[PDB]
Paper text:
Finally, the complex structures of the EGF-bound EGFR/HER2 and homodimeric EGFR ectodomains were refined to 3.3 Å and 3.8 Å resolution, respectively. The EGFR–EGF/HER2 dimer adopted a heart-shaped structure, similar to the dimer structures of other family members. EGF wedged into the cleft between Domains I and III of EGFR, stabilizing it in the extended conformation and exposing the dimerization interface of Domain II. On the other side of the complex, HER2 retained the same conformation as in its monomer form or in complex with HER3, consistent with its ligand-independent manner for signal transduction. Since Domain II of HER2 was presented in the unbent conformation, it dimerized with EGFR in an asymmetric manner, consistent with that of the NRG1β-bound HER2/HER3, EREG-bound human EGFR, and Spitz-bound Drosophila EGFR complexes. Specifically, for the EGFR/HER2 complex, both the N- and C-terminal regions of Domain II interacted more closely with their counterparts relative to the EGFR homodimer, burying 884 Å2 and 412 Å2 surface areas, respectively. Strikingly, the DAs of EGFR and HER2 adopted different conformations. The DA of HER2 was inserted properly into its binding pocket on EGFR and made extensive polar and nonpolar interactions, whereas the tip region of the EGFR DA was almost dissociated from HER2, maintaining little contact with Domain III. As a result, the total BSA between the DAs was only 1395 Å2 in the EGFR/HER2 complex (910 Å2 on the HER2 DA side and 485 Å2 on the EGFR DA side), which is less than that of the EGFR homodimer (1769 Å2).
The proteins in the human epidermal growth factor receptor (HER or ErbB) family are some of the most thoroughly studied receptor tyrosine kinases. Thus, to facilitate downstream signaling, it must either form heterodimers with other HER proteins once their specific ligands have bound or self-assemble into ligand-independent homodimer under the condition of overexpression.
Residue numbers in the entry:
A (entry chain A): 27 to 594
B (entry chain B): 24 to 120, 134 to 599
C (entry chain C): 5 to 51
Write the structure that this text describes.
Amino acid sequence: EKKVCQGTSNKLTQLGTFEDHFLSLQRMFNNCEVVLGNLEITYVQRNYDLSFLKTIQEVAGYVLIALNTVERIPLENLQIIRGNMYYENSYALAVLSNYDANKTGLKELPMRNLQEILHGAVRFSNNPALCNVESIQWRDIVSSDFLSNMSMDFQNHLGSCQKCDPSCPNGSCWGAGEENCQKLTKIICAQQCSGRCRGKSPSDCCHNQCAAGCTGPRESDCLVCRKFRDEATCKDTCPPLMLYNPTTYQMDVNPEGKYSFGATCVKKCPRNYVVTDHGSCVRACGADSYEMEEDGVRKCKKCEGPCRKVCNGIGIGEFKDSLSINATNIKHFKNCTSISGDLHILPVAFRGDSFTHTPPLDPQELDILKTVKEITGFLLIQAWPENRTDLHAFENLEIIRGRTKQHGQFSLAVVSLNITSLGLRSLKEISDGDVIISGNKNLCYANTINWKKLFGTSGQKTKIISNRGENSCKATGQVCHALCSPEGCWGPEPRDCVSCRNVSRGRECVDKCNLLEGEPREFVENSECIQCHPECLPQAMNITCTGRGPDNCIQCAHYIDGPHCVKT
Amino acid sequence: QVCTGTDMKLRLPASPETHLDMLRHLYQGCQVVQGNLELTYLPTNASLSFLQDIQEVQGYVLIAHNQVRQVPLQRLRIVRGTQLFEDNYALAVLDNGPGGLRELQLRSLTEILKGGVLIQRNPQLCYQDTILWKDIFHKNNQLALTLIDTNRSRACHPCSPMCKGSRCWGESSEDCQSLTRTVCAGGCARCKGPLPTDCCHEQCAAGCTGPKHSDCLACLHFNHSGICELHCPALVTYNTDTFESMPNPEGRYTFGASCVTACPYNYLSTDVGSCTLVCPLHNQEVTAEDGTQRCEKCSKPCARVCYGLGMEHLREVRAVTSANIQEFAGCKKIFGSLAFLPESFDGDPASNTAPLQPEQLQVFETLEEITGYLYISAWPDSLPDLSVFQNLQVIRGRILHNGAYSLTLQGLGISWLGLRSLRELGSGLALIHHNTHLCFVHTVPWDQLFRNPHQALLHTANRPEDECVGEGLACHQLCARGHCWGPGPTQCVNCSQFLRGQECVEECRVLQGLPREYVNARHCLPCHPECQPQNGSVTCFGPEADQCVACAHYKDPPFCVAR
Amino acid sequence: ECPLSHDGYCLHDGVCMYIEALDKYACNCVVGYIGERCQYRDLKWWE
Ligand SMILES: *[C@@H]1O[C@H](CO)[C@@H](O[C@@H]2O[C@H](CO)[C@@H](O)[C@H](O[C@@H]3O[C@H](CO)[C@@H](O)[C@H](O[C@H]4O[C@H](CO)[C@@H](O)[C@H](O)[C@@H]4O)[C@@H]3O)[C@H]2NC(C)=O)[C@H](O)[C@H]1NC(C)=O
Ligand SMILES: *[C@@H]1O[C@H](CO)[C@@H](O[C@@H]2O[C@H](CO)[C@@H](O)[C@H](O)[C@H]2NC(C)=O)[C@H](O)[C@H]1NC(C)=O
Ligand SMILES: *[C@@H]1O[C@H](CO)[C@@H](O)[C@H](O)[C@H]1NC(C)=O
Ligand SMILES: *[C@@H]1O[C@H](CO)[C@@H](O)[C@H](O)[C@H]1NC(C)=O
C-alpha cells in the first residue's frame, strides 16, 4: 500500500561505530517502499547484507551512496528518484568515493528498475572497482534540463571485471546476468508525445504524467506518477469539489473531484491543515492571509488592514538552515503570536557557537516566548537552565497543530531536561503527532496526564518512560494535588490541574469561591465562578449575584436605575 | 481576432439590409469563434471576403436559407461543437436554394469533436454524399448522426483524377479531401500519411505538420504560446515539498478553448484562472481599478442582488411585464438583460397579465449598469425619448440579442434618444431600423461608446436628412464636435462649458444673476443662498457659507445664518 | 583532526573528522543521536 518511509538527513555522519551505524541503517529502512526523505547509504562494511534495501521503490530526495565497503548494494526495485532535496545544489544521485585501502569497494550497483530522475543530476567519484556502471548512458535517465551540470569519471584498474550482456541494445547493462540491462524509455522512442514510452511503437507511448515508463496508454496501467497521485491513476491536477454545470448553470457535486494533500489526492484535509479555495491541503497559506476557520475546518482568507507580521519559524523561510533558536533569531519573535513553523531549543544556544560566531542565548529572553500562542509544526526542547524548575516559557502555548513533525512522527519532545514540572498550563489540544517525554532526570507528573483526551486524531501513541519513577515523588515535596480530578496535573502549584471539579475561577483552583463568608461573591457559570458586577452589595448569608449583569442583585450598592445597580 | 458569434437559430433577420453588414462587422478577421458560425438569409452578390480566415468554431456551423453560389470557408479547420444547433448536430446546411449552394469547398475541415451533420433540402449541391465523415469525426462520436440529402436535381462532373478515393468537395484539383483518420496505422488518432512515423501528437486535433506538439493543425484542449495540451497552466502552483501554494508567473488565463495572457473586456475572471461571462454563486463582481473586472469570494450572507432576464429567476419569459417589475426595485446593477417586446404592452385575456404604463418605468431611473443587451421594440406615445434610462452609464453586453446586438430599437415612436449618461457599450452591436420618427441617429458619438474593433452602428430606414433640416431638427452649438443626443441643451455628452444641474449652460452666474454659484472644474454648483451678492467680484467659493467675503444679515463664527 | 575554523561545529560530544576522499568536514556522533552536526536525538527509541 506504499508504506511511508521517513528517510535520513544525516549526510556523511557516522552514528557511533560502524556496527551501530549499520544497525541504525537497517532499523531505519526496514520494509519501506516510498522514501519521502533521503536515501543515504554511508559506512557499510564488507561482511554485511543489505536485503532491506530491496523493498525501496522510490525516493523523494537525493540518493547519496558514499564511503562504503560492501560489494553489492541491492537497490533493485528502486524505480524513480524525485530529487526534491539537492546535495550540491544540482545533484541527486551521488556515488562518492566507495573504496578501501585495497581499492575494492562497491563492485556493482544493480539499479534495475531505475528509469528516470526528475530533479537533480548524477555525480560519480572515486570508484576504482565498479562494473557495469560505466556503460550506462544517462541521457535516458536524466532529463534535458539538468544535463549540463553533471559529470562523472571511471578508473577501472586491476578489477578483473567480466563482459556485459550482448543481448541488450547499446551495451548498457546494470549487472552481469540475463535480463539485467537498462530498460531505456527515451531514445528508442518516437517523438510524437512529450512523455515516456515502453517500446519503439509511435502510437503506444505513455501518459504525460506517467513518469518512469508505463504498462499501457491508460493512466491506471502506470508505474509511478509525476506531480499528483490519484487513486490507482496519475493526474496532473485532480479536480476540485464544485465545477460548472451546463444544465442548471450552478455549482455541481464532484464526480471524481478530491482535495490535494501533497503528492496524493485525498477526499478530506486533516483538521489542522488549511483548506484553501482551490482545494489543496496546505501547511501555510499565502503571505497576505488570515488563518481563521469558517465552518469547522481551518481556512485562510484575504486579510485587510495592516496585515502586520507572520512568523516563519525554524526550518522554513529565511531560517531554513538555522537548527535552533538562539540569541540572534529570538528578536524576530518579539511581537509574534502564531508560530507557522518549528521551535528547537537545543544545547548549542547555551554553550556558544564558534563556527557561526553567535553569542550564547540569554536565559531571560525565553520570556519573549511567553508572547507566542500556537505552533503549527513541532516542538523539540533539549535544553533548559539548571536554576529554573519549570518550563514557564510556554505558559500560553494553547494548541500544537503538528503539521511538521520530527522524523514524521513526533510533535512534542521535551527530552533531556533538568525540570521538576512541565507547567504547560494552557496545552489543551494536539492536532497531530506523537508525544515523547524521556531521558529526564527529576521529572515526575508525566504518567498522570492522560493524553488520550488531549489529541483527537486516532492512531497516536505516547512514549513516557524512565523519567523519575513512581516511588521517587512519594515524598511531601511532590504530589499531584488534592481536590481536583486525577485526569491531569502539570505541577505542584494549585494552578496546574487540567480539569478542576469544584472551582475553576481563572488559572488557579481553590477550596471554594465563598458565597457566604467572602467579600467577593462569584456566581457559578459553567463550573467557572467569576466575579459579578462590582456595584452589587454583598448580602448576609444569601445569594448575592445570580448572573453576569447589573440586573442580578437584590440590594444595589449606590443607586437604583430600574433593575440596574448604578454607581451614580 | 476573437469574435463572439451570433445566435440566430431559424428566425428571420430584424433588418435584411444590414444583416450582411452585421456579418461583415463581426466575422471579419476572426480565426477563433467563441460562439457559432451562422450564415442565415444571404442573397446573391454578397461579398464574403471576411470568411477567408475563420479556423476555429467552438459551437456549430450553420448555413441556412442562403442564395449565394459559394461559401468561402476553405480555411475552416476545427468545429468543436460546445453548443449544438439541434441535439446531435454540428454542421447544418439547410434550405439553400440561379441561387443555391454550388460547392461547399470545405478543404481544411477534418475534425468535429461533438455533434453530427445535417445537410438537407439543397437541390444545387453535388458532393454532399461522397464525403467520408468517419475520417472527420472523433472516436467518441463515431456513431454520429450523418443525415445527408439525396435529391440533387442536377447532374454534374465527377471528382478530379489527380487524387484517388473519389473524396472531393468540389470540382477543383486542389479541393479533394485528404484522409487524416482512415489512413493511419496502429492506434494513431490523426496522421499525415500512412506511415507510423508521420502520426500526430495526441493533443493535436485536426492533424499536424510534424510529430511535435507545438505544430498541430488544430489543438484538442488548450493552447498557449503555440504549445497546446490537456491541462492549462493555472495561476496556483502547489509545491509538494513544504506543502505550500505559490502564485505562478507562467500561469495563463483560460479563455474559451485557449489560454491567453489576459482575457479581454466583458470576461469576468475567477480565482482558478478561468474567465467567462457570468460568475457563480457567493461571488460579487468587483472592479480591479484597471478597466477590467475580476470577481472574488463575497461575505458570509450574500443574500440579495438584482437579477434580470436570462438568469436564475427569469428563464422562460422574454419580455418585462408587470409580473416581473417588482424584482427591479431600485437596483443599480441588473444581472442579465432587458427586453421590451410588443406583447409586453398588450393585454392577454385569461392570463391576469396587465399591460405596462408610462408611469411604471420610473423604477428604472436609478439603473446604471446592464450586464446584457437592451432590446426595445414597443414604446407608447406618452414621452418621445428614453428619459427613463437617462442614468444608464454602461451596457456590458455579455448576453446578446441574437448573439450579435446589444442595443436594439425596432419600430418605435422615438424622435430623439435622450440616453445622456451612456458612456460605454461593451460588446455586441447597435441596431436601429424602421424608426420613422428618429432623426438624431448619426449625432451620437458611437466611436466613443465602443471598446472592441468589431463594433459598429447599423442604422437603416430612419428619418432622412431632408426632414431634419427644414423642420429644425438640430440641437444647440454647446454639444462639441456634433456629439449630440437631443434638441435640448441638457443632453450634450461633452460640452466645453460648465454644468448647471446636468445641463450645459454658457456662463455661470458668478458676476451676475440673482443667485450665486461657485465654479467647479467641470460643474457649476449653487451654494448657500444667504451669501451677500458681490456686484462685480467672485462671490461664492464653497458650499458652506463660511467661505464668503460677506454675507447678508448675521455674522456668526461657524457660518452666516438668517436667524 | 579538523582545524580551528571548524571547532565547535559538531555537537553532543561528537568528534570532528576530515574526509580526505571528498575534502569534507564531518561528524562522528555518540550512540544515540542523529543529524548532520549531531544535533538531533533519535526520538523513536529510549531517551
Ligand atoms: C543562530 O541563529 C542564526 C540564525 O539567525 C544561525 O545563522 C545561520 O547559520 C547557518 C549556518 O550555515 C547559515 O546557513 C544561515 O544562513 C546563511 O547566511 C549567510 C549570510 O551571508 C549566507 O551566505 C549563507 O548562504 C550559504 O551558506 C552556506 C555556504 O556553504 C550554504 O550551506 C547555504 O546553503 C547557503 O548556500 C546562508 O544563507 C544563517 N542564518 C542567518 C540568518 O544568519 C546560526 O547558525 C545559529 N547559531 C547556532 C545554532 O549555534
Ligand atoms: C496556438 O496559439 C498560437 C499563439 O497565438 C497560434 O499562433 C498564431 O497563429 C496565427 C495564425 O493565423 C499567426 O498569425 C500568429 O502570428 C501566431 N502567433 C504566434 C505567437 O506565433 C496558433 O495558431 C494556435 N493554434 C495552433 C493549432 O497552434
Ligand atoms: C526487519 O523487519 C523484519 C520483518 O519481519 C524483522 O523480521 C526483522 O527482525 C527486522 N530487522 C530489524 C533490524 O529490526
Ligand atoms: C546548474 O544548471 C543550471 C541551469 O538550469 C544553472 O543555472 C546553474 O548555475 C547550474 N549550477 C549549479 C546549480 O551549481
